[PDB]
């Protein structure tokens, strides 16, 4: 029977603190049932970049018991102060939609 979604988890879940010019890496992990497909969507503050340049394209999938996993990752290599804000991942599979969020900080100072 399943077209239900369990949850949408982010990683790193907390303390996402970056210095201006540092690799941002978020991992949106969507847990679903076996007979389920997923469609991701990322909201973010910056408007310089495209969706196809930061968010991954490839199919990261896994299956086990009566569940599955879908992974998508937004990656800003070298950020600016305008890139600071609230980042939201939204998983969508037709009969159900679940999302999750986390705030990415950008401090005006160099990187080691």
């Amino acid at each position, epitope marked *: 029977p399943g077209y239900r979604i369990y949850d949408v988890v982010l990683s790193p879940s907390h303390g996402i603190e970056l210095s201006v010019g540092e690799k941002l890496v978020l991992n949106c992990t969507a847990r679903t049932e076996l007979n389920v*497909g997923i*469609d*991701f*969507n990322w909201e973010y503050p910056s408007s310089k970049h495209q969706h196809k340049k930061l968010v991954n394209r490839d199919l990261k999938t896994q299956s086990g018991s009566e569940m599955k996993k879908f992974l998508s990752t937004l990656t800003i290599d070298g950020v600016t102060r305008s890139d600071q804000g609230l980042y*939201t991942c*939204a998983a*969508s599979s037709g*009969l*159900m939609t679940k999302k999750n969020s986390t705030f990415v900080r950008v401090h005006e100072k160099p990187f080691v």
Partner: antibody
Amino acid sequence: VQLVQSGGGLVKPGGSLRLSCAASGFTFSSYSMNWVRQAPGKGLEWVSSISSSSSYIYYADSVKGRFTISRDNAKNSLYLQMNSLRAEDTAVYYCARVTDAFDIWGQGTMVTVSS
Amino acid sequence: DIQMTQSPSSVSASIGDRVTITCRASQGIDNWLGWYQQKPGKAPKLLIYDASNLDTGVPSRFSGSGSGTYFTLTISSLQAEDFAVYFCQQAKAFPPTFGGGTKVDIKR
């Protein structure tokens, strides 16, 4: 948070109608949009579903190979091109956002099919 | 697929009464249930989802419970607005089915 529908009305059997549901007040391109109908003095019948970027679609068996659901995220609208109509499709049709359930609903447009 | 049937057909109550409504499924759906309110000449509004989780804006007097195939909705105290039809819903397996509907009306 708001959905506003348009179109509907009279149509003869075999004809064609297109219902449009314009979303407003949220990130339209993130949520799974749906369609649900309700005939005179009847229960709610789910008709169709669609994902954010239109990669996944489901139809209720009754309307399979007839109605075509699609969306335009640039226009923040959901569509339902209804072809090969029947008198049994005479109902009130609602578009609806789906999160964990059907949380938002459009006002609803009555579509009457008769020769 | 799944068949959702409500009980009873219609319930009579005046202002102040504690109303209760039931919804039964043909097969198991754990706790992925919905509850909707519809008034004459309006689109349905979501009251409760996931068995007993009230949507943002719904009064606290509404309350759901139950699991598996058996489910229940309850109104602690009735008010003029509450006179309407109430549907249950299933979101386990496609297609998502609805309940017949129970019209709460004015008792006399």
